[PDB]
Structures are given as C-alpha cells and as structure tokens.
Write a protein that binds this DNA or RNA. Structure first.
Ligand SMILES: [Mg+2]
Ligand SMILES: [Mg+2]
Ligand SMILES: [Mg+2]
Ligand SMILES: [Mg+2]
Ligand SMILES: [Mg+2]
Ligand SMILES: [Mg+2]
Ligand SMILES: [Mg+2]
Ligand SMILES: [Mg+2]
Ligand SMILES: [Mg+2]
Ligand SMILES: [Mg+2]
Ligand SMILES: [Mg+2]
Ligand SMILES: [Mg+2]
Ligand SMILES: [Mg+2]
Ligand SMILES: [Mg+2]
Lengths: 260, 188, 59
RNA sequence: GAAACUGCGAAUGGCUCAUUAAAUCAGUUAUCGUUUAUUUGAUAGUUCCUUUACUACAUGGAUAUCUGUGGUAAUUCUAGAG
RNA sequence: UUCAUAAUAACUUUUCGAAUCGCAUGGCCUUGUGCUGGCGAUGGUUCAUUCAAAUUUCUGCCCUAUCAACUUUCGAUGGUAGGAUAGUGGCCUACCAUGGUUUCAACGGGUAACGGGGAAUAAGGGUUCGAUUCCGGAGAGGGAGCCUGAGAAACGGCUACCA
C-alpha cells in the first residue's frame, strides 16, 4: 500500500536483535544501507542492547553525534545504520574494535578484535561483470563494487578488502576442502569445511559441510561464506569456534565449568 | 482512465469477476499518440519513476538505414503506403511502427554517388582509386534500383514513434521488400 | 465605484471614490490593459492617461 | 533570529472490516518481464569546433516575504503598486 | 539469451558533464598578493546495492444442484501486427481462427465471509471460532476522475455527480 514502509513493529523485528517483547511498541527499522534488513544489525541495537554503553535511544544518538563510532573506517551518524556480517565497528575512545560475526546459536556476537585485523574487511562475491567502457567490476555480497578485480575472482569467492582504501589485497577461491562460515538458515553461525558441492542447474546449489567434530550438514550456496583453508581461517572466529553443541552437551558444559 | 488491469476481464472459465479495488495508477495507460506526417511536434509525458516518453503527434523527418551498405541518412517521410494492422491508418496517414513509408531517397542517392560513382537511373585521383578498389560490390537488388529511378524508396519504420518521439527505420530489402511489393499489388 | 490609483515613477498610491456614474461611464465595457484618459473621468484629472489594470467586484 | 522562498516530508503511522469465495491470503517460485526518492559502493581531462586579440577573478531577468493601496457579511479569499 | 560489454551508422524541438555552501588558513618564492593546497556539506551520470514495486509459478478456501450447462453482438480462448504501459500480457485496437471451463462440480446463489499467524475445547481422531495487539489486503459517505511526486488513482490533496 502506497510507497515504502517506514516503521517496524517490535514483534515483526528480526529475532536475533535479541529485542525484548515489552518496553515499547516499535523496533529500530534499519535504514536503506549496505546489508539486507533481516540480515543486518542496526547501530542502535549494537550500542544499547549489546555493549550497554547507552541506556536509551537519545544516549545512542548523542554517542553517534560526537563522531566516534566507525563502521568500516567510515564514520556514520545514523542510529538505524545497518551494519551486518563482517562489518568492523571501531570506537575511537575505549580503543576497542569489533567485527560483527555470528555465534554458534544464531545471533550477532560481541567479538572483540585487535587493530591488525580491524584494518581489513572480508567479503563474499555476489556478481562479476563488465561495466561501462568495458571496465570489469566485482560486487561484494556485503555492499561494495570494486573496479578492475583480479580476473580469476569469480562468484562465491571471498575477498580481503583492505578497507582503508577499499582495494582487494587477496582472495580465496570457492572450492572443496576450504573453511566455510554459514550466514543463513538454521545452520547460521556454524563453521565447516565443504565436503561436496551439489549443483541442480535450475534452482539452488546445495553445499555439504563437515565441521571439526565430523558432523555433516547441508545448506544453500547463497548462505555459505568462505573463510580460509581448513584449520586456518583468515579472521578470528568467536568463542566456541562456530561448532554447535547438542543441548545436553551444552548443559553439561555449563555444569562442569561452574565457577561462581 | 484506461487501465491495463486484468481485474475487469472474465476468468479462463468465463466467470465474471467481482469488483475488488478501484483502478490504480500503476495499472494506468494513456491515450494513443497516433502520429501524423508534417511539421515536427513532440509532446513529453511524465512516466513512472520520473522519465519522459515523447508523443510524436506530427513528424516529418526520420533517419533510415540501408542495412546492405551500412549507412543511415536523415530524410523526409512522404506518405504511408501500407500498414499490416489497419488500412484505416494508411488512409489517415498515421505513422506507427512496422508501417511502410516512402522516403525522399535523394540523400541516399547522393551517398551512393559519393561511394561508387555509378549513379542510379541510367574528379580527384584518390577518389578514382577508391572507386576502382570497390566496384562489382555496386550491383544492388533490381527493385531498389527501380524505386530509385522514381525518386521514392520504400522503408519500414522500426521505432515506436509514440514512445521515443524519434521516427526511424530501415529501407526495404531482399525477400521482405518483395513480399511488401506483392501485398501492395494485391491491395490495388 | 472606488479607484486605486498608483504612480510607479514615484512609487506612491492613493484611493479615490467617485459618487457619480457619469464620471465612471468612461470605464464601462473597457478591458484590463487599456488606456483611459483622465479628462472624461474628472475635471480635476487633466492631461492624465490611466492604464486600467486589475480590480475587484462587489462581494 | 520571526517571516517567506527553496529543499524535504506529508504515500509512514493510526483506524476500520464494507466489499471480496480462485479474489484476498498462506507456503512456494519467477522478473532472461519491469520501475525504484533515499542508501552504500562506483563513476565523467574530450562541454571547444579551426587554433593572431576571448564573461569565466564568475551571466541574465524575475518573484516571495517586507513597505504601502485596497476589495468582500464572510475562508487558512488575494487584487494593485514599490 | 538478440546477456554484460564493445564496435561501425546516423539521429535528437541535444539529457548530463558543479557559475553551490561551512570551517580550516597550511606549502614554494619566479616577493606577486602570485601560484597553490586540508577537512567537509549539498548537488549530479550511469551502474551497484538497499528500502521497496508491480506483476508471476505451483498447491490449498465455507454452505448450496429447490444453480447443469457456462463464456463468445459490447474479448470469450488462441494467432498476427500495432497501440498503450515502468515493463509482460485481449491490457486495448485491426484482421483472422473457434476456441476456453465443466458431474474430479464449471457457472449461478448465499455468507449474520476480510485471508493467515492463531483461539476455545482437549485420550486418539476431531468440532467450532479468528471484527481485534503481528503479517498480508482492501476503504476513508457513495461512485468516478486526476494533480504533485521516487511512490497516491491519496481523501486530516484537488475536480465533478449522487446522498
Ligand atoms: Mg536463476
Ligand atoms: Mg531514473
Ligand atoms: Mg515550504
Ligand atoms: Mg498504513
Ligand atoms: Mg543489448
Ligand atoms: Mg504484442
Ligand atoms: Mg462482510
Ligand atoms: Mg473466517
Ligand atoms: Mg482476522
Ligand atoms: Mg462485521
Ligand atoms: Mg462515516
Ligand atoms: Mg479517494
Ligand atoms: Mg479525518
Ligand atoms: Mg490518511
């Protein structure tokens, strides 16, 4: 009905916002940005509901204004700016750097990171095409277009963007026996190896993934994000190395590592 | 206004559908331009998402392509002789797409002369040399040649003049041209 | 019949009422953007030529 | 820093369930069938038109508010001049 | 894929290619006030993308035969070409063909029918309800018609008619 929608009801929000059912009718709708609405994570949520540096929206706004938050080197001032997967959130005071990565369960984890890694962003390849004047460009599944790419970078390949300038420093080819991260579905937040790649030339390629504990699962190709060569990831993965325990196992862990 | 909705239609079964929702602006369709010949007059229309289509009510000139030779020239359109959809259009002189029209042809003739030097109906040294290098390539379909003699070439419009404002096409060649001629003859 | 006289050279304006239809009869069936002499309007206005431009109906 | 011009928004929200029975809608596809402000990336030495004296150290005319003259029983009515 | 893209032909009542703003006041002397240069705002081209958008595939709706034939002059089903549209398409127009749906209920009638998530009940199976907090969809007394705009056939916009 008539043009774009501008609000978001609290229940209609992505569940991995971890937003509480009460204390409001509305949720912070991610503005038009680099990442998809449902796959994003607004700055407000990151600030208030994760790190707890702000108490309310006004506080968040104030924080933003003094030009201190930095999403991928660039500044940002939107409360509802949609930082998503692999995005580096740097705070100038505190000197903390964060990379937005998922965890074993599904939601965005607070993952503290060093300045040596915070310099670069890792990004999947969505499209490879020749643009105007015959100039080749690559499209990252995370927002960007990069002109004149290395011509053996194809779709689904992951790319090390140096972020400070925005040039491709290095890349990983999508292939069997390469460390992978799942970014959508039930298996989202899981880390694996790629055992096999089914095709079905028509609709949705399925990739078979084994983790470190020899525990195979299948996801769609567009949910699968390459991260390195097995055992050696290009980024630091969060605590619990994207592993997925069974519920009982988790409970046991909780019990046996008690230290109140 | 004229709407392109499939709401007002009957279903596959022949069932008359009930009137759900009043007609929308995204369903809309505007009046026919039905362009005439003589003195250039082009009205812009604001479409969806900004953008302009150009209604070409009254057009005189047009640039037409000789696909064999590989050249196109701006030329006067003088009359619609045949239109596949409707004889009414022909009667009117309504310039549309796929209509068959008569072109001034003089520019084409001039071009030909410049190129080969052979002329249709009956200097420097470099030019002569060039001509020599060419030749025998200058033969053409007989029908075209005949037309040239009269001074008016048959061409088909391939632009949608109601959409672009631009009125453009291709000079009639080969089998298609022959077919068109036959059709014309039949009509007479 | 009231009149709204404006002199653009000086940039000065005045409102002058007429109590007689004979003095206003000069304006009857005249169009906006026409030249009307002051002589027949008033014995006071002599050598004057008005441009009638704009006005208001009753109500 | 009132006003006014310009920009942007007013198509979201809120309410209601009258219509509506392959319609809506649900899950599922598709756009190699299109439009898309905004967004975040991209991106344009070529506007010249002969090349011995040329606006570019920057071109033109308006119009709002305002100041004044009013119209109407009246309205978020607006004429005339500067 | 007649794709992306490039190339030759020309066309065009020739779109765009910054006569725009704030704070900085830095660097070489050819010692002019010269040539320069920093961080930003707004803009602007096409391509991205994002928020969207129109359509769109397959499958699924409650009673009723005291509705068995229905659709096709006034588009019904298909073809061809055009027009129109943001674009696909009988969406509309011209010419042509005679199809399309149906006892595995078409079509018609009713609904004290908005659809769904769901709710009440509660061995298993079910039955009834869902105007209503979320998601779709409609509508702003009724019907039309449009302006502005990226987006409305908008009604705390306009134009008309009826009440
Ligand atoms: Mg596909
Ligand atoms: Mg556009
Ligand atoms: Mg305004
Ligand atoms: Mg609404
Ligand atoms: Mg092409
Ligand atoms: Mg067609
Ligand atoms: Mg009802
Ligand atoms: Mg119901
Ligand atoms: Mg309901
Ligand atoms: Mg009711
Ligand atoms: Mg009422
Ligand atoms: Mg309305
Ligand atoms: Mg109201
Ligand atoms: Mg409203």
């Amino acid at each position: 009905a008539r043009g774009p929608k501008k609000h978001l009801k609290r229940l209609a929000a992505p569940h991995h916002w971890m937003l509480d059912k009460l204390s409001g009718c509305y949720a912070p709708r991610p503005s038009a940005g680099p990442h998809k609405l449902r796959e994003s994570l607004p700055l407000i949520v990151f600030l208030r509901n994760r790190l707890k540096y702000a108490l309310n929206g006004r506080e968040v706004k104030a924080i933003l204004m003094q030009r201190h938050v930095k999403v991928d080197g660039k500044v940002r001032t939107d409360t509802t700016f949609p930082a998503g997967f692999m995005d580096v959130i740097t705070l100038e005071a505190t000197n903390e750097n964060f990379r937005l990565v998922y965890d074993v369960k599904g939601r965005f984890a607070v993952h503290r990171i060093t300045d040596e890694e915070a310099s670069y962003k890792l990004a999947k390849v969505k499209k490879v095409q020749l643009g105007k004047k015959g100039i080749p460009y690559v499209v990252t599944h995370d927002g960007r277009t990069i002109r004149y790419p290395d011509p053996n970078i194809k779709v689904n390949d992951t790319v090390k963007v140096d972020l400070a300038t925005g040039t491709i420093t290095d890349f990983i080819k999508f292939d069997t026996g390469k460390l992978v991260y799942v970014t959508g579905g039930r298996n989202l937040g899981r880390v694996g190896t790629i055992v096999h790649r089914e095709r079905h030339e028509g609709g949705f390629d399925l990739v078979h993934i084994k983790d470190s504990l020899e525990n195979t699962f299948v996801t769609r190709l567009n949910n699968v994000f390459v991260i390195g060569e097995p055992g050696r990831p290009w980024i630091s993965l969060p605590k619990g190395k994207g592993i997925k325990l069974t519920i009982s196992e988790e409970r046991d862990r909780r019990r046996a590592q008690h230290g109140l | 206004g004229i709407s392109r909705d499939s709401r007002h239609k009957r279903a596959a079964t022949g069932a008359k559908r009930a009137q759900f929702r009043k007609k929308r602006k995204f369903e809309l369709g505007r009046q026919a331009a039905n362009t005439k010949i003589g003195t250039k007059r082009i009205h812009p229309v604001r479409t969806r998402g900004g953008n302009q289509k150009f209604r070409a009510l009254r057009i005189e000139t047009g640039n037409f392509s000789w696909a064999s030779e590989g050249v196109a020239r701006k030329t006067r359109i003088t009359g619609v002789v045949y239109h596949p959809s409707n004889n009414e259009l022909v009667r009117t002189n309504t310039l549309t797409k796929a209509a068959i029209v008569q072109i001034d042809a003089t520019p084409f003739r001039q071009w030909y002369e410049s190129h080969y030097g052979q002329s249709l109906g009956k200097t420097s040294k470099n030019t002569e040399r060039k001509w020599a290098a060419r030749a025998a390539e200058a033969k053409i379909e007989h029908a075209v040649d005949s037309q040239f003699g009269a001074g008016r070439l048959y061409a088909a419009i391939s632009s949608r003049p109601g959409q672009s404002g631009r009125c453009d096409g291709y000079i009639l060649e080969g089998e298609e041209l022959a077919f068109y001629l036959r059709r014309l003859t039949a009509k007479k | 019949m009231k009149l709204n006289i404006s002199y653009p050279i000086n940039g000065t304006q005045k409102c002058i009422e007429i109590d007689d239809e004979h003095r206003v009869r000069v304006f009857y069936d005249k169009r906006i953007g026409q030249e009307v002499d002051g002589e027949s309007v008033g014995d006071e206005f002599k050598g004057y030529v008005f441009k009638i431009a704009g006005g208001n109906d009753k109500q």
